[PDB]
Amino acid sequence: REFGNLARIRHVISYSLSPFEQRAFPSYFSKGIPNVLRRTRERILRVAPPFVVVYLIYTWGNQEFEQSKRKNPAMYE
Amino acid sequence: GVHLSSPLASVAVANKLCQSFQTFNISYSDTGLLGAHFVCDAMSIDDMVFFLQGQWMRLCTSATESEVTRGKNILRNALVSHLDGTTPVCEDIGRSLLTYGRRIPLAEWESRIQEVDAQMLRDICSKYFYDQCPAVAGYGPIEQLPDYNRIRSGMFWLRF
């Protein structure tokens, strides 16, 4: 339940420093930009095609609604 | 038993917290490690860290004259008991000439001990303990041993 009897971990060594001794933003841009680009490249082909077909359906529906509100020139008489 | 003068050991025997603890002051050329080391069960590490940090900051803030003179008497007895014996006397001579460059007599040690009082103790403890980043070494079932953020947050108080 609490800390102490959660998991069984053996032979694992963890290394940590002080927050007051290490930087809060260590290479925030020079490493942040490639990481964000890599994450976007990894998960861009699962979200963008549904959102683009949403955009296409939205434009098609608005356009054909405007065309349905348009006057058909078949009723000249 | 429960009648031990030191509050950390009194709390340990009252709550059955630890198997053992000790305070150490290891010194090297203009550096050192000042702290404590405890052997305890996996279900009491957080409590021992909390109580040890509380005792450290009690010495930092409100150390009193009775425990100051108790610690002074303990230090006098420890120094003389260590310097009783030819082998520890020779060890002290060699180590003193290698580190200090001279053999400090027990009279000078006692003079420094008498110079130590309560205000000096809390000032030096606030200089070397209060709001300082520690070094933590855990081995074994140390899952309940708190992270560095909680250890540092115990290494200060919000009420001084």
Residue-by-residue DSSP string for B11-43: HHHHHT-EEEEEEEEEEETTEEEEEEEEEE-TT
Q: Which of B122, B150, B120 is nearest to B134 (CA)?
A: B150
Mutate to test the interface with B, among A10, A18, A20, A22 (most CBs of B within 10 A): A18
Q: What angle do CA B15, B21, B26 make, to 5 degrees?
A: 155
- Can you tell me whether residue A56 is helix, strand or coil? helix
Chain breaks in chain A (C to N over 2.5 A) after: none
Q: What is the DSSP letter of A74?
A: T
Tell me the C-alpha distance between A7 and B133, whole Å.
29
Q: Which chain B residues contact residue A2 at CB under 8 A?
A: 144
Chain B neighbors of A8, CB-CB under 8 A = none
- The residue in chain B having the minimum alpha-carbon distance to the alpha carbon of residue A3 is B144
* Buried/exposed B36-67: b ≥16 CB within 10 Å, e otherwise: eebebeeebbbbbbbbbbebbbbbbeebeeeb
From chain A, pick out residues whose CB is under 8 angstroms from the CB of B139: none
How far is Cα A41 from Cα A35, in angstroms, rounded to an integer? 10
- B130 interfaces chain A, CB cutoff of 8 Å: no
Resolution in A: 3.3
Q: Are B80 and B106 in contact (CB under 8 A)?
A: yes
Choose the mutation target among B143, B144, B152, B155 for the interface with A, i.e. most A CBs under 10 Å.
B143
By what technique were these coordinates determined? cryo-EM
Q: Residue B54 to residues A12, B77, B121, B157: CA-CA distances in angstroms?
A: 30, 26, 16, 9
> Does B152 contact A at CB distance below 8 Å?
yes
Instruction: Estimate the crossing angle of helix B106-115 against helix B65-82, to 10 degrees.
Output: 170
Q: How many degrees, rounded to 5, is the angle at CA B132 between CA B129 and CA B134?
A: 95
Q: How far apart are the first and last CA of chain B?
A: 31
List CB contacts (< 8 A) between B141 and chain A. 4
By the CB < 8 Å criterion, does A9 face chain B?
A: yes
- Residue A50: what residue type? P
